[PDB]
Design a protein around this motif. Structure first.
Motif, PDB file in Angstrom:
ATOM      1  N   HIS B  39       0.827  -1.188   0.000  1.00 38.70           N
ATOM      2  CA  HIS B  39       0.000   0.000   0.000  1.00 38.70           C
ATOM      3  C   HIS B  39       0.867   1.246   0.000  1.00 38.70           C
ATOM      4  N   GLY B  40       0.411   2.262  -0.718  1.00 38.17           N
ATOM      5  CA  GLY B  40       1.140   3.504  -0.877  1.00 38.17           C
ATOM      6  C   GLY B  40       2.059   3.516  -2.077  1.00 38.17           C
ATOM      7  N   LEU B  41       3.256   4.071  -1.907  1.00 35.63           N
ATOM      8  CA  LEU B  41       4.296   4.046  -2.931  1.00 35.63           C
ATOM      9  C   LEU B  41       3.844   4.726  -4.219  1.00 35.63           C
ATOM     10  N   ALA B  42       3.347   5.950  -4.086  1.00 37.58           N
ATOM     11  CA  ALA B  42       2.680   6.611  -5.200  1.00 37.58           C
ATOM     12  C   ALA B  42       3.639   6.910  -6.344  1.00 37.58           C
ATOM     13  N   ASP B  43       4.806   7.445  -6.031  1.00 36.25           N
ATOM     14  CA  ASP B  43       5.869   7.649  -7.007  1.00 36.25           C
ATOM     15  C   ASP B  43       6.678   6.399  -7.306  1.00 36.25           C
ATOM     16  N   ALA B  44       5.999   5.318  -7.667  1.00 36.17           N
ATOM     17  CA  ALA B  44       6.649   4.119  -8.176  1.00 36.17           C
ATOM     18  C   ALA B  44       6.359   3.958  -9.659  1.00 36.17           C
ATOM     19  N   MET B  45       7.418   3.893 -10.453  1.00 34.90           N
ATOM     20  CA  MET B  45       7.310   3.619 -11.874  1.00 34.90           C
ATOM     21  C   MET B  45       7.176   2.124 -12.089  1.00 34.90           C
ATOM     22  N   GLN B  46       6.527   1.739 -13.180  1.00 33.54           N
ATOM     23  CA  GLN B  46       6.498   0.325 -13.517  1.00 33.54           C
ATOM     24  C   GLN B  46       7.868  -0.157 -13.950  1.00 33.54           C
ATOM     25  N   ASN B  62       2.950  -4.468 -11.301  1.00 28.52           N
ATOM     26  CA  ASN B  62       1.526  -4.221 -11.439  1.00 28.52           C
ATOM     27  C   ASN B  62       1.151  -2.983 -10.647  1.00 28.52           C
ATOM     28  N   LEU B  63       0.699  -1.940 -11.331  1.00 32.89           N
ATOM     29  CA  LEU B  63       0.322  -0.701 -10.664  1.00 32.89           C
ATOM     30  C   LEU B  63      -1.191  -0.543 -10.708  1.00 32.89           C
ATOM     31  N   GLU B  64      -1.857  -1.199  -9.772  1.00 31.05           N
ATOM     32  CA  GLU B  64      -3.280  -1.017  -9.604  1.00 31.05           C
ATOM     33  C   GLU B  64      -3.546   0.329  -8.954  1.00 31.05           C
ATOM     34  N   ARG B  65      -4.794   0.758  -9.008  1.00 37.40           N
ATOM     35  CA  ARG B  65      -5.230   1.802  -8.101  1.00 37.40           C
ATOM     36  C   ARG B  65      -5.241   1.248  -6.688  1.00 37.40           C
ATOM     37  N   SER B  67      -3.122  -0.055  -4.896  1.00 37.21           N
ATOM     38  CA  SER B  67      -2.231  -1.146  -4.522  1.00 37.21           C
ATOM     39  C   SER B  67      -1.096  -1.217  -5.524  1.00 37.21           C
ATOM     40  N   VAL B  68       0.007  -1.827  -5.107  1.00 36.21           N
ATOM     41  CA  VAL B  68       1.084  -2.225  -6.005  1.00 36.21           C
ATOM     42  C   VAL B  68       1.351  -3.717  -5.873  1.00 36.21           C
TER      43      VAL B  68
END
Ligand SMILES: Nc1ncnc2c1ncn2[C@@H]1O[C@H](COP(=O)(O)OP(=O)(O)O)[C@@H](O)[C@H]1O
Ligand SMILES: [Mg+2]
Lengths: 460, 83, 173, 113
Positions: B39-46, B62-65, B67-68
């Motif tokens: 949960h979180g980690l908004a500035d994560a690139m794929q 996998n960058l869900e809304r 979740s990651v």
């Protein structure tokens, strides 16, 4: 100004949320900065409140949730016209040949509707080709669609390079080559070949290779049509070569489930027939101008029953079925004369001697096929004499279908042969009438006209 | 009372001292079979590498809304929630 | 969309507010719950994977000015099912249900300019004869109407604009 | 400390407090009627729930039972003690002879050389 934000990035599929007013419509383009890289997205669905689901026309790597997206209020638009001649481009119509800007006068959207039923124009203006088997069994008119069906390694590309040599050089009109899902080496080899032969000034090239993300392989076929349709609307006669129709459908399959679609019969998308139709009904010769097209069709696993080849069979005027058996036996080109046909093979529109020769050839080869397993088990001695005759004439006919190509010289070390249509008829009729019954089978193998069959017979 | 009631809420939220995660940080919320959900980690690139506790890394695939999905590069039986 | 998960809770609340004669209080209570659920920090708490019991305490504590029957339970049960983003839809569901039982229609009228209040009262009494409800007109001044009026009565509408007739005639040609 | 929340055939879900949730292969113990059942953790789900596999008969378990969190894997006797004997998956003796006189026990989830 930018107006949307990325909310999901699952593999190649990107979702963007917008204000509930002015949501982008379907097939629009969108733009996002993937770091320094300008990335284009194409809108595929309007789903839910304000959200659109989209495909990346580039690599999806490096995208974050919450990036700003700007909506261009048009489809993907490509350069069209004379400025496209001699230039390699990608799916977006950007030059990939490092010769600079395209310099286009006009740009056209790649999504457009097909000609109306009253616009279509009838033609039977038969093209002649050097290839014996094709001109005997599947002759095709200017303005028609030709499909080369085969599994892997049966000669689709070598045939298409031969047909490009024979047809395009006599053709004075502009041509388009669409390399859908082509191997990058083969695209470079083609570009250099045209550049050396000095025919590159009348061909426009669009290349979307295997390495590119699915959206490129999906949409590159439509950029090819959009260029050819510009030339047709100017009134030209155009030659359109498409390297694989199959990898358009496959590029649809890869992304279909991530778009939320329920799977169909062999895992294909539910929309396979519509996706094939919407593309293939644009490739037509109208009253204003004619497109003539040659398409190679991959046959997965070498089964002609797979949905993808099975549907495309119903769109084509001529269908040259290549077979792996004949290639494995070493007869080239590996055309199956029993499966391949054309709707121009009519006694009314070909010469009636041509039609009679074709019916004879097919009848004989069919009669050989049923004998094959009988001889294999029970032996040749248990044929009768009139069958021993027709099995010999069948072998002579099945050798005289083979031919050396100028573009298949590098593989075999022999010169290339071009046979005129008349000479082909004259030879096959002579063989069936038995005027050459006394010559050995190799006197017909890998030869040009039947006068060359008697010259080589003399040397034999 | 919309402006007053939303101020009342903002002050009570702050006074409870619940607080956001920082961008570039998150917490593991599920560990299963060598796949973690963060949960979180908004500035994560794929395709980015995210540092786990330890010197272990995971690839964010996998960058869900909200979740990651990341895949663990190595043994994963050492991870837990709240990391 | 949350409308479907809203429906069981909105029906349970609406069925319950009439057992306790406080529909009017419940409506503003839910409008409260819908306004707080929009807050940017509260939405992060909602997305933050606490266990439902401790998350329930972390929401019930922050919305304490609610009855024991009303706030502390509806918010908790929707929180166990993770439905709290349905709250703006639970609100509209609740309102509609009320307007149904009270035999009311929130009729909208649209016009290029204000009506004479005789035109508008005639519209009220006539819509109340067309329907079988007490209507509640609200007007809109849209300049594209140019002349005449639109009456929208929920899912049903009655176009009297000149623009609609102009574009109808353009297609009769 | 934890409680059983689901019993789906062979798998058993246990809910723990947020600060002491068992690691990905630890063992738990339940009294299933008159018998003690060991569970092995397989997944940490969110909210402190773990999915476990029952090392024994799963019938008779009731939701709401209390599990006990052992803080080690399944550890089995090894060496010269386990040499003439028949043993169970939990490394218990299965022959009717007495206890296994081991000096050492190893966890069964190890790494390849
Ligand atoms: N007419 C031919 N003469 C000699 N070799 C051929 C001929 N046709 C095919 N081959 C051989 O078979 C290969 C596979 O066919 P090709 O057209 O290159 O790929 P595909 O058939 O899959 O498009 C050719 O590269 C060549 O090695
Ligand atoms: Mg090929």
């Amino acid at each position: 100004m930018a107006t949307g934000k990325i909310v999901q990035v699952i593999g190649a599929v990107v979702d963007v949320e917008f204000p509930q007013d002015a949501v982008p419509r379907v097939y629009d383009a969108l733009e996002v900065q993937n770091g320094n890289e300008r990335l284009v997205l194409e809108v595929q669905q309007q789903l839910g409140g304000g959200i659109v689901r989209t495909i990346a026309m580039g690599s999806s790597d490096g995208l974050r949730r919450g990036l700003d997206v700007k909506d261009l209020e048009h489809p993907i638009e490509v350069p069209v016209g004379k400025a496209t001649l001699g230039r390699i481009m990608n799916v977006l119509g950007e030059p990939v040949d490092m010769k600079g800007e395209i310099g286009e006068e006009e740009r056209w959207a790649i999504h457009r509707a097909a000609p109306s039923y009253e616009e279509l124009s009838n033609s039977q203006e038969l093209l002649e080709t050097g290839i014996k088997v094709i001109d005997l069994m599947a002759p095709f008119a200017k303005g028609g669609k030709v499909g080369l069906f085969g599994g892997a390694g049966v000669g689709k590309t070598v045939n298409m390079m031969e047909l490009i040599r024979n047809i395009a050089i006599e053709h004075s009109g502009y041509s388009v080559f669409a390399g859908v899902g082509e191997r990058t080496r083969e695209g470079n080899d083609f570009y250099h070949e045209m550049t050396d032969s000095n025919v590159i000034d009348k061909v426009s090239l669009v290349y979307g290779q295997m390495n590119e993300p699915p959206g490129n392989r999906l949409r590159v076929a439509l950029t090819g049509l959009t260029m050819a349709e510009k030339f047709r609307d100017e009134g030209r006669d155009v030659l359109l070569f498409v390297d694989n129709i199959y990898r358009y459908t496959l590029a649809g399959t890869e992304v279909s489930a991530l778009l939320g679609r329920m799977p169909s019969a062999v895992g294909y998308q539910p929309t396979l027939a519509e996706e094939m139709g919407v593309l293939q009904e644009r490739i037509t010769s109208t009253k204003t101008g004619s497109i003539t097209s040659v398409q190679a069709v991959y046959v997965p696993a070498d089964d002609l029953t797979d949905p993808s080849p099975a549907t495309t069979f119903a769109h084509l005027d001529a269908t040259v079925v290549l077979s792996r058996q004949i290639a494995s036996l070493g007869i080239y080109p590996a055309v199956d004369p029993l499966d391949s046909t054309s709707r121009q093979l009519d006694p009314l529109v070909v010469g009636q001697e041509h039609y009679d020769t074709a019916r004879g050839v097919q009848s004989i080869l069919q009669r050989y096929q049923e004998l094959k397993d009988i001889i294999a088990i029970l032996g040749m001695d248990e044929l009768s004499e009139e069958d021993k005759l027709v099995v010999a004439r069948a072998r002579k006919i099945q050798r005289f279908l083979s031919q050396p190509f100028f573009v298949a010289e590098v593989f075999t070390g022999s010169p290339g042969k071009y046979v005129s249509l008349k000479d082909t008829i004259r030879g096959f009729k002579g063989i069936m009438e038995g005027e050459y019954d006394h010559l050995p089978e190799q006197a017909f193998y890998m030869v040009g006209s039947i006068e060359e069959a008697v010259e080589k017979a003399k040397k034999l | 009372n919309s402006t007053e009631i939303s101020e009342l809420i903002k002050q009570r939220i702050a006074q409870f001292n619940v607080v956001s995660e920082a961008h570039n940080e998150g917490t593991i919320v599920s560990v299963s079979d060598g796949v973690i959900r963060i949960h979180g980690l908004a500035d994560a690139m794929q395709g980015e590498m995210i540092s786990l506790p330890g010197n272990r890394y995971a690839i964010a695939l996998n960058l869900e809304r909200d979740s990651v999905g990341a895949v663990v590069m190595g043994p994963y039986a050492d991870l837990a929630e709240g990391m | 969309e949350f409308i479907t998960v809203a429906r069981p809770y909105a029906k349970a609340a609406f069925d319950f507010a009439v057992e306790h004669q406080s529909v009017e209080r419940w409506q503003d209570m839910l409008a409260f719950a819908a306004e707080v659920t929009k807050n940017e920090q509260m939405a992060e708490l909602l997305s933050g994977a606490l266990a439902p019991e401790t998350l329930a305490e972390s929401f019930i504590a922050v919305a304490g000015e609610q009855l024991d029957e009303n706030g502390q339970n509806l918010i908790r049960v929707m929180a166990e099912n993770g439905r709290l983003n349905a709250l703006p839809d639970v609100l509209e569901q609740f309102i509609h249900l009320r307007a149904v039982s009270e035999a009311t229609a929130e009729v909208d009228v649209i016009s290029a300019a204000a009506l004479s209040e005789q035109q508008l009262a005639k519209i009220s009494a006539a819509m109340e004869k067309r329907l079988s409800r007490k209507v509640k007109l609200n007007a809109k001044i849209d300049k594209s109407v140019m002349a005449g009026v639109i009456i929208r009565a929920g899912d049903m509408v009655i176009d009297g604009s000149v623009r609609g007739r102009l574009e109808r005639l353009a297609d009769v040609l």
